[model samples]
Structures are given as C-alpha cells and as structure tokens.
Target chain A: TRDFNGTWEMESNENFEGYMKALDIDFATRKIAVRLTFTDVIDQDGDNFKTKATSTHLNYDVDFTVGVEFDEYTKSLDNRHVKALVTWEGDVLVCVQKGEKENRGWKKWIEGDKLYLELTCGDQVCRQVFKKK
Target chain B: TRDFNGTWEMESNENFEGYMKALDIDFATRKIAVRLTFTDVIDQDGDNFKTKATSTHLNYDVDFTVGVEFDEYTKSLDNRHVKALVTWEGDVLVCVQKGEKENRGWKKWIEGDKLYLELTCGDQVCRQVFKKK
Candidate 1:
C-alpha cells in the first residue's frame, strides 16, 4: 500500500508546451503558461484518493477511487469533457481518460522521494517531476 | 538585494477557492483547482526576473523587471488583461495590476526558506505558501 498523503512541488517538466499546443490552448495563454510552476497535494485514504494541483495562474482538483470510473470536465485548461478511470499497474497509478481526443490520459508513480506525472494528449506527452515537501 | 531565485513548492493555500469563484471559474474547474499544488521557479538576474508556474494540468510563465510596467494577459486562469507593475517595498515584491477588476494584484515575500504569495482579484484575497528547494 502506498501512502501519498503529503504536499509535492514540481521540479522539472518536459514537452509541456507541446502538450498544451495539442490541447489547442490559445497563443496568449501559452506564451505565459510556459513559465509557471505547479504544486500538488495528495490525500490517499485506502482506495479513495484525492489530488490537487495548484499554481499562481491556475488550479485543478480531483477525487477518485481506484478501479472506479467517473465523469470529469476540464473547465479552464481545455474545457473538455471526459470519463476518467484510475487503476493500479503494479505500484504505479495509471489513469485512462476517454474523451474526444485519442490517447489522452496521465500516469503517476513514486520513485524514491520524487513523484512523477506523465500527461498525454493526442500524440504529445508531457512529463512532470515533483518532490515531496 | 533580494534575490527571488531557485525553486519553490506550495505548502498551504488560504481562500483560494473563493478567489477562483470570484474570477468566475466554473464549478468543475474550481473543484479540481482547489486541490492542486503549485511550484514556482524564479530566475532573477539584476532587475530582470523570469518565472514559471507548472502543474500537471496547466502552466503559466511571466517575465518582468523591477519598477517596470508591462502588459500582462492571464491566459488560462481568469483570461483577463492587465497592466502590471512590480516594485520593491522593503524586502517584499509587490505587484499592482491595473485593469477591469477592482483591487486586482499580488504580493510576494520570503520568510526563512518559505516563499509567500498573495493573489487578489475583485474583493477576494488568496494566500499561498511555498517552500524553497
């Protein structure tokens, strides 16, 4: 069992701009978005997990139970609607987002003191790293 | 001289959901945004500063110089436009945003190894804390 009950901060990101572009974020937004940092808080209670991503510019929160599927509406990022399900592959937490775009979802894992997040949309994949605080 | 350098991760946020609501963020976005953790990477060189806020869902970046005013367009957050100015008041970095909303701005300061950010829009004020990495 993994205890992901703590605050985590982003360390580095790869190909985030490309991912945003694939999402069709506007030029003015992307121009400023390419320079912001993100933070995360995870509260894991057995199979029910809650996670939040906060930044000075924008924020997102989600609550889910493992192996359960729920409806999700991304309001600010892309204003898209999707059905999201999170499951465990070994020790890693994998998510599948079923929506208009193909191959859209995220995967989360813990390695040592670092938390890793991989975001996928269309053919673009964005990787983000966070350290426990 | 105060150097706003290095990476900082979020610790706690106060009244952020209210602030987002005041910005008219939809119910779904606010629900997800309240649980997000944010990270900030500040690169300060003399009077020029560049900052990036990254998250699993979205990102924002900005560049400015102390005591210089610039046109800032917040893309994903509130999708607003403002004329922004940053100034030094003691050791605090105070930003005054002039635009449509009343009393819209933010302030940043350092305490020990923690970075504090105060975001304001309309009549709502949100406080966020970040720890240095």
Candidate 2:
C-alpha cells in the first residue's frame, strides 16, 4: 500500500477552473481558485481516514472509512451532500461521489515523493500534482 | 440491516457496579453509579455509527465503523486507549476492545421496543435494558 500519511503542497494544477465551472461554482469564485495554493494533509488510521484540503480562502476536512459509503457534506466545495465511497485499487485511493453532479469523484495516488490528485466533474477532469511536505 | 438509528432510554441495569469495579472504578463513584439513569443514543449511517451513553453524572460518546478497527480512547471510564472493532451478528452488534484490560467489550441488540446491552470485562458481565426513546 502507498504511504499517503504526509502533508503535501500543490506543485501544479490543470483544468481546475473547468472542473469548478462544471460543479456550478460562481465565476467570481473561480477567479481566485485557479491560482490558489492548495495543501493536502491526509491521515490514515487502519481503514479510517481524515483528509483535509487547505487553502487561503477556505478549507475542507473529511473523515471516512474505506469501502463504506458515508454521507459527505461538501463544505466550501459544492456545499452539498453526497453519498461518497472510497476504495483502494493497488496503491491508489479512488472515490465515487453519488450526487446531483455527474461523473463526480476523485482519484489520489502517491508516486515517489509526489502526490497526484485527479478531480472530476461532468466532462471536466482536473489534474493536480503535489510534492510531499 | 438493523435499524439502530433511534435514541434509547435505559430502563434497568444489573451488575453495572460490579462491571465498573472490574474496570477499577472507585467505591465512591460506584455507590452513586449503581442507581444512575443511563440513556443510549445510537445513530447508524451505512456501516458508520455514533453511539452515545448518557448518564446524569458523566457521558461517553463513540463514533466508529463496523468491521474497521480503530483506536478508542476511553474518557471518564478507564481513560485509556484501546484497539476496538465492531461487527454485526444477526441483528446484534458486538464490539471487541483490546488493551490493558482483558476480555473487554459489549454486545448490543434491539428486542421489540427495548435495547439490550451486555457489558463484559474480565470475569464480570453486566446487563442493561433500555426502552426506545
């Protein structure tokens, strides 16, 4: 299994604004989101996980268990409730978000000293690369 | 799956003082604890659970996922960390707590409008019956 216990600093991001637009985020909010410095802190306790995404404007924290569908209230993100399930495929952690938004969810993996995140919504796919902090 | 989502009110308790003694609870506290009214509030979201044991004196709240072992820090009770896991047997929910104390755990089940709990620690076994709230 991949060791994703460390804090990560975003190195690069692509099409994040497009993903935000698909989620119906306001154009005004998307202005600062594209250039925002994002940091991810992930903690894993057995199959239980507490992951936090931090930025200057707002932060989102989620607590969940692998293979179990939990009600995820997306605060600061879409501000909606979604049935979210996280699963492990090899060293990667994948999530399927069942909500009003189509093709939603995220894929997270660790490669070497880098952490990669793929955020999806509708037809938009956003890729973000981060370095271990 | 068992619907353990409702709040429950404790109706009667047997050998609770003895079970507390096994956990080394003080004699002064045991005297007051024996006749205390205990209320249990349980919430289930998929395999996730938040169980609260409410007494006028002190309350204990626990959040966990079934089949996933998590570090449980006991407060107001033993005040120690234990590796705890919960699993379902028929309609009954059984928990196994592994720590300094031996044979620690509790089994919970719903019978009609009643909620039954069997608390086990060392050689002591305590039973508590609660009415649906």
Candidate 3:
C-alpha cells in the first residue's frame, strides 16, 4: 500500500521552465522559483491529505481529500488560483488542476524507495524524483 | 567585495556530521539530515542582515546588525540556545556562536557567482557551496 506518508527530498528535476511557461509564470519569478531546493512533506490518512512543499524563502501548504475538489492557490509558485481534485490510480496518486489552464495535471507514485512526481501543463511535463527520509 | 545578498541554492556539501557531532547532535537525526537539500536566503543592509537557511525540516532565521551579540535559539536545528555575534571580516560575514560548545562559528562569502558557507565546531568544519539564483 502506498500511503504517501513521509518527508520527501527532491533529488532530481527536469524541464521546469517549459512547465512553468505553460502555466504562464513570469520569467523572472520562474527563474527565482527553481533557484531554491524543495522538500515535500505529506501527511496522508485514508482519503485525506495535507501536503506542504517548502523552498528556501517560500512554501505552499494545502489540505485536501481524495475525490473532493478544492480551491487551490499556488501562492508562491506562479500565484495562480485553480480547482484541484485528487484520485488514486492503482498505486499512483493523480490530480487534475482546472482553471484557466487546459489539460493540467500531476501524478505521484512510489518506486524503488523513491517518490516520482510528474507535472503537466499545456504540452510540457516537469518530472522530478525524490528520496524519502 | 562580498555583500552576501542573494538567493542561493545548495550545490554541494561535505562533513556535516563532525560539525553536528560537535554540536552534540545524535546520529539518528544526522542520517536524515544529510539526505536533504538546503538553501540560503540572505538580505543585507548597510549594517543589518536577515539570513535564513533552509534544511528540509529545519530552518534557522536570524536578524541582527553588525556588532550586536544577541541571544539566539537554534530552534529546530540542534534546539540549543546561544549568544550570537556577527561581524564583517573584510566583507566576509563571520558569525560566532557562544554556547555550551567552544570555537563554534560560521563564515559566509561569495565567490564566482556562488555562495560559500563553512560551519565550524570543535575544530570540525562542514562546508557547503551554493549557486546564486
């Protein structure tokens, strides 16, 4: 069972700019966003989840449950407002963010004692891998 | 001239244990500590400085002016209290922490568009390098 319960450290990331550009993030801010390291702390219980990602100077914290759509404000990262709903796909946790953007979604899974996150926006995908502590 | 004003992302680090050990940190916590990413956000004025270091679950934020030895609580990192004095050594910021441990200090400087941090305790040094944002 993939509980998604642990502190995850980002070990690798790729194509961040393309995904950020797809989300209409400004150039300077996008440059600043990737300049800091990120850590994802997830507390999951059954269908409820509290996820927090903290960088050096900024952090985003939100609480949402699976299958329930909630308003999401990507405050520090692009500062966009969207509707987010998460669901389980086999062992992979998936989320689709709906708002001004089209076909924007994300998938998270566990493999080989590591966590993999694939984020999508427009035609870009930002893939990142993490190790749990 | 090292102004020490920049958003820096950790690129490399080494020998964190001996410094942590000199600070009397337990090994169980040190193992998780090494597997995480870190960053430094520094804001400096003519005489005052706001420096914050992010270490995954732990963060140390301190604000002080030159020549003021203020009481500082280490908070999530080591959880110890110390008197801190920050001074400029030829534009390089040097901070000495006075507490249970002697010769405990840290130095921060900028070199080749990168930030360098060296933490010292009991003759042990943990050096970390960071690239500017």
Candidate 4:
C-alpha cells in the first residue's frame, strides 16, 4: 500500500458532462469543457502540502496542514464558504465541510492501484475513479 | 432582488486554499488549483438549466430539468454518492442532497449585481459571491 503522494492525471470521466448539465451549465460551456484535458498535481508531505487544479481556463490552489481547522472560500468554485477539517482514516482521506449545504466536501481513497475520489456537493454525491498514468 | 439565471465568471476568492487543505488535497494540487481561473456557464430555461464549470485541467458538466430525478457521478471530486433535487425558493436556487450525510447541497441567488452561491457538505458551509462580467 502506498500513501497518496504524487501527481495524478485524469484518465477518464463517466457521466461528468451529465453531472455538470444537472448543475445548469449551458451547452456551449459543456462542449468546451469536455474537450479539455485534465491533470491534478498533488504533493503529500506527512500531513501538509499544497494542492492545485490547473488548466488553460482555470487554476485553483490551496495549502493546509492536516488536522488543523481552517476557513475556505471556494472562490471561482461553486462559491461557498465553510469551516473544514481533514483527517486520515486508514488510507482514506476524509474531509468534513461544515456549512449551509447539508452534506458536502468529499472523501478520497486508493483502491488496488487506482485513485478513488468521492465528491458530495449536496445530497448528490459523485464518485470518480482515476488511474495513474 | 432578482432571479439569477445566466453565465458568470469567477472574479475573486478568499481563504480557498485553507479549505482545500482541510480537504487534504495535498500541496501540489492546491498550488495548481488556486491560480486557475473559473468560468461557470448556466442556461436557465424556466425551472431547469444546463451547468458547467470549465478550466484547463478540469471540466464538470450537469443537466437538471427542474424537479426531475436523476443520477450523478462526481468523478475526481471528494467522491460521494447522493440523490438530489433542485427547487426554487423565492428567487434562490435550492438543492437538497439526500444520502448518508446528515445535510448537504447548495443554494444560489443574486444580490444587487453579484452572484451568491452557498455550498454545504455537512455542518460546514461555504459562501461565495461573484461579480458578473
């Protein structure tokens, strides 16, 4: 078993377009988004490191020391502010987002050499699996 | 007060990094994500619309036909599965996610010339305000 600490690329997405559509994204935007490639850079340093989601259209960055509580502004994201904390349970990374939306944030884990990411924006939780390239 | 249904771009962010940190997104992921710009395209057709968040690295799309039930897979996110429904609450977009979590979802509204979105995962809620371009 390996601790999740390295760069990962988005190999495929199942129903990602449909999920965005459910969020009310227009056709033009959807077309452009689907055509773009994705690469997520992750750095693991014991319990502290920086994270960034980069692309030609947008780039989101954040830094934190695990187990420490902090405030988060989603900014260009869905634009929600919340108090959040992350902890490690076994090999899974669990995040609890405390705010207006009932259930939010996500849980990340590794299964059989594959990276598993679970996103819970509302009652609608989406699970995405990625293979390291 | 007005109904918010249109295309909007992310103007600014506050404390987003700390929130991602709380999510245990790692340092490299945070670094690439923060600098990325975000553009949200929305098409409001009566009670439903298509939504998409586009950047160079990530592109998420979803479609909701107001009050209609659907299945969603939030790949590469915090990976969680949830059932959701979107409704209008006096000019605000209210979504309720039902599943293992106690409370979850997001609420969106417009104030003066700004777009306001609230995202909740559990007890933690995140609030963000974006200026229309």
Candidate lDDT values, in order: 0.61, 0.58, 0.58, 0.54
Evaluated at residue B57, the lDDT of candidate 2 is: 30
Model 4: C-alpha RMSD to truth? Answer: 23.0
Candidate achieving the largest lDDT: 1
Better of 1 and 2 by lDDT: 1
Clashes of each: 31, 0, 0, 88
- lDDT score of residue B73 within candidate 3: 76
Candidates 1 onward: DockQ, in order: 0.04, 0.01, 0.03, 0.04
Error of 1 at A58 (Å): 16
- The digit string of per-residue lDDT tens for model 1 on B1-133 reads 2333456565445565644444445665566566666675556554344545544444344656667788888754556789988777776768898987767787766565555667676555656666644
C-alpha TM-scores of all predictions = 0.37, 0.31, 0.35, 0.33
True contacts kept of each: 0.01, 0.00, 0.01, 0.08
Across B1-133, the per-residue lDDT of candidate 2 in tens digits comes to 2333454544445555544454344565456456455444445575455544434333243556668888877543445789988877766778899887777887766565454557677665655554432
- Whole-structure CA lDDT of model 3: 0.58
Candidate 4 chain A, poorest ten consecutive residues by summed lDDT:
A1-10
Which candidate wins on TM-score?
Answer: 1
Off by over 4 Å in 1: A1-133, B1-55
Question: What is the TM-score of candidate 2?
Answer: 0.31
Which segments of model 3 are wrong by more than 4 Å?
A1-55, B1-133
Per-residue lDDT of candidate 1, residues A67-128 (tens digit): 77888776545667899887777766678989877777877665665556666766556566
Better of 1 and 3 by DockQ: 1
CAPRI docking class of candidate 4: incorrect
